[PDB]
Structure 1
Amino acid sequence: DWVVAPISVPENGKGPFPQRLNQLKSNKDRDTKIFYSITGPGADSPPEGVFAVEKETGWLLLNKPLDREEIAKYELFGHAVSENGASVEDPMNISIIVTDQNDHKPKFTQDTFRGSVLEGVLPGTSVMQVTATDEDDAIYTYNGVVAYSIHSQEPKDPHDLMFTIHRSTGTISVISSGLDREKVPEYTLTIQATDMDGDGSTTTAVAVVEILD
């Protein structure tokens, strides 16, 4: 049984590189000199040379920082060969799981979202629902969890802050009375989406609200 438990490595490691991860050891090295090697995507096939193993010592090395959103999991195989050329172990399955950091900003699905209401809708009326996605994890962390907010409203008649947005759903609602198509037939809202549920970084898009006739 030549085996190694799965290894989890956060993306965007600071190093220094190369970074030791685990030492591969065959116990057949008491009988002879052993040369270690690694194969698989990330080792000997694309992306090549992300991982390596030190020939004499069997230290598995990470050569550069990982990116979860490029490759989230690696399956490599370790090999142990004697000086006389015989493989002395069955190849070792080496599992490497890349864990998340918050390194993607949210992205709105559209640059412009449009919706419309009747002029006489009451306060609390839902206008439209906007959406932003985030490529980071949102299962175990907030890296991928978006909070929505309104950035600003034009024009500011009959007053400002006439709309709100649901922080989690992105539903934009009317919160004031005083819509009047004859005075202001359309509002341009700049809307924001922020990750870490409001504590992280932020992107913007526009929502245009038409007051119907």
Structure 2
Amino acid sequence: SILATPILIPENQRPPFPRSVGKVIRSEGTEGAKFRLSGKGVDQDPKGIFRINEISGDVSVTRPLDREAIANYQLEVEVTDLSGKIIDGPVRLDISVIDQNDNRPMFKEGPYVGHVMEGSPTGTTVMRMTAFDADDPSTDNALLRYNILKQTPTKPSPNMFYIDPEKGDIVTVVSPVLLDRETMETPKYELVIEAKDMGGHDVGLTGTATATILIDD
């Protein structure tokens, strides 16, 4: 009878506030009855972000929210007497904050340096390079896809390596007969690694980091 629904709310809502977000329905209900709300977000830190209209059962939010700060609130609603005795025992009101894409992919282990053998077979792992993302990992908003943007130098061949778009594993793609040194200038290679958002998708957010790769004897 007290009855009402799990509210979803996008983070980073623009002003003004407060804004309606849901509505607790009762029915079987006296006159001079009052919806009262409580729990985390009302009267437990963070106090004061959610409000119910005591007549209409309109649940409203009073300010913008941050999913990577707080991802869920569990509130409790109830109706009351003219006095304050509960004429409709308390039920749970769940609020899920919806991920918005407001974090940029960023590498956090740098500087990045891996070594590899001069004359290695294809698919030999140089190193691993995973990026971090403060957004929801179960949404496109985290979900990373990796690419190599630049190789220096561009000899013997322009792209000697290739990264796992999924795992971020750098591996060798070039034979022993060129992937060597003998008459080499700098022992090493310089790779510009990009991690992008929304799993590839033309329109992601990016983070970079240049890996330094040393050819070994």
Global fold match (TM > 0.5)? yes
Q: Secondary structure at the match of 1:133?
A: coil
Deviations 1:57-84 (A, max 9, x none): 3211111222222222111011322333
User: Do 2:2 and 2:78's aligned partners in 1 also have CA atoms closer than 8 Å?
Assistant: no
What's the counterpart of residue 150 of structure 1? 148
What's the counterpart of residue 65 of structure 1? 64
89-98 or 49-58: bigger deviation = 49-58
Question: Which residue, 186, 192, 195 being the options, matches 1:193?
Answer: 195
Question: 1:39 and 1:133 mapped to 2: Cα distance?
Answer: 35
What's the counterpart of residue 10 of structure 1? 10
What's the counterpart of residue 174 of structure 1? 172
158-167 or 62-71: bigger deviation = 158-167
What's the counterpart of residue 208 of structure 2? 204
Which consecutive unaligned segments of at least 5 residues does structure 1 have? Answer: none
TM-score normalised by length of structure 2: 0.85
Which consecutive unaligned segments of at least 5 residues does structure 2 have? Answer: none
**1:19 partner amino acid:** R
Q: Secondary structure at the match of 2:199?
A: helix
Q: How does 1:90-109 map to 2 (within 5 A)?
A: 90-109=89-108
* Residue 12 of structure 1, CA deviation: 2.7
Aligned residues: 211
Q: Secondary structure at the match of 1:196?
A: coil
Question: 1:149 and 1:175 mapped to 2: Cα distance?
Answer: 14
**2:173 partner amino acid:** I
Percentage of matched positions with identical amino acids: 35
Q: Secondary structure at the match of 1:149?
A: strand
User: Do 2:124 and 2:171's aligned partners in 1 also have CA atoms closer than 8 Å?
Assistant: yes
Describe the shift of the 1:181–1:124 C-alpha distance in structure 2 as closer, same or farther (beyond 3 A): farther
User: Do 1:188 and 1:208's aligned partners in 2 also have CA atoms closer than 8 Å?
Assistant: yes
Deviations 1:37-61 (A, max 9, x none): 2111111121122111123332111
Describe the shift of the 1:84–1:169 C-alpha distance in structure 2 as closer, same or farther (beyond 3 A): closer
186-195 or 175-184: bigger deviation = 175-184
User: Do 1:147 and 1:197's aligned partners in 2 also have CA atoms closer than 8 Å?
Assistant: yes
Q: Is the counterpart of residue 116 in structure 1 residue 118 in structure 2? A: no
Describe the shift of the 1:12–1:87 C-alpha distance in structure 2 as closer, same or farther (beyond 3 A): same
